């Protein structure tokens, strides 16, 4: 798999577990088409979203449902989600706080 | 002025100047409607985007054109832009500062919400 | 005033108020000598730490007491403090803003250096 | 090993390779005693710094030599190093830019 998503919780110092992640690809008609989705594991990682064959050149959006994550912990956060948009191994990492997030791409191989 | 945007450059240690910023509001048909826009100043700040009267409760998106900024500096970037999506909340008086710190392969955004 | 410190709270989305900040300068015997200190204001900013005349080229450490801040909010933190160590450089006129964004298990610090 | 250090480069979107890391422990006389050191690998990770037996309760400082890293890439950075100070699995992660860094602790098991 050429795409992995890793989510960390900066309040608890832990992986962010069971976070929903949705991936979209921009279609020829300029709309966002749903591409893949999943939930982070106990390690905060989401593997297997796609394959080398399916992950063609294009514009991709990774939407991380941070709001549901914080609300399940009792926290009303600022952001609706964390959005990562890029043109195409990619690791998309997100570090979450209730009123802040950071995202980093690590691109290897 | 209930909404300000501030952008910093983590490579040069400087305000990120002349960065395009677009604000959208989610419409009833679930599309994003352009709302306001501008360019960051020499202090990296964008003031005057909206008014207390216009900035009603709703879902907003602030799109920061980071890719064009890094292209102007000759540094290859990862992201097309930085997007900040939030629901505003008129429970008490509020001012929103959306702060973004930019690196070519990383950004962070923070909301500073004050009375 | 060539050196300012600004601290934000990523959990509450607010300036980090009443945070103790200590500045040190490296002495000839390689020890850290206290130089200046204060507490952040209601805007999360600490002004007036030093003067252009006092702030000569050297190695400085800015220590932000993040642990006491999180203890006051009742949130268990990881770090004892946030430390920012840098060499100042009087090649042209400069102002230094040391900005820190605090979470209980994470912080980021950025230098904004302007003419 | 109860302590791992991971360093990422936010300019290139890559692990930060061959970064020097020094660990100190505060002694009873209130001085910093050198505890362990190493260099990050091709994955940006530094494993094996210590053992469960050696990593007793105490105050630790992890000093990451970011200045040498940037200077080897032609960049004159702001910070002399990134310092992480904490009282005691710990993963200390640092994300580096020339005028900014972030550090996050991920504490598991």
């Amino acid at each position: 798999c050429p795409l992995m998503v890793k989510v960390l919780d900066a309040v608890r110092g832990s992986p962010a577990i069971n976070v929903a992640v949705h991936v979209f690809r921009k279609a020829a008609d300029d709309t966002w088409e749903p591409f893949a989705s999943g939930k982070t594991s106990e390690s905060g990682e989401l593997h297997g979203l796609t394959t080398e064959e399916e992950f063609v050149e294009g514009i991709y959006k990774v939407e991380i449902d941070t709001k549901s994550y914080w609300k399940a912990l009792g926290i009303s956060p600022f952001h609706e989600h964390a959005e990562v948009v890029f043109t195409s191994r990619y690791t998309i990492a997100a570090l979450l706080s209730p009123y802040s997030y950071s995202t980093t791409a690590v691109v290897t191989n």
Side-chain angles (χ1 to χ4, degrees), chain A:
Chain A
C1 180
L3 180 61
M4 190 267 272
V5 179
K6 180 168 174 66
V7 190
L8 299 179
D9 177 331
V11 171
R12 303 193 290 173
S14 69
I17 300 169
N18 201 37
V19 179
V21 178
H22 289 80
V23 187
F24 306 82
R25 187 181 176 278
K26 188 173 287 183
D29 57 10
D30 258 17
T31 61
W32 288 112
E33 295 282 359
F35 186 77
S37 60
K39 286 280 197 164
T40 59
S41 73
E42 47 287 347
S43 67
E45 299 183 358
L46 176 50
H47 297 260
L49 278 167
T50 185
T51 63
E52 291 220 306
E53 300 168 307
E54 182 188 37
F55 192 57
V56 300
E57 293 184 313
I59 304 174
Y60 290 87
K61 173 185 289 193
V62 178
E63 277 200 354
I64 304 171
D65 183 3
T66 60
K67 186 174 182 181
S68 294
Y69 177 77
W70 291 117
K71 287 181 55 53
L73 303 179
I75 290 166
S76 299
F78 182 76
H79 301 88
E80 291 293 310
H81 51 245
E83 250 172 338
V84 180
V85 183
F86 67 99
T87 298
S88 71
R89 303 293 195 255
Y90 297 74
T91 300
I92 304 296
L95 176 67
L96 307 185
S97 305
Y99 275 69
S100 181
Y101 66 89
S102 66
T103 185
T104 306
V106 183
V107 180
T108 58
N109 266 121

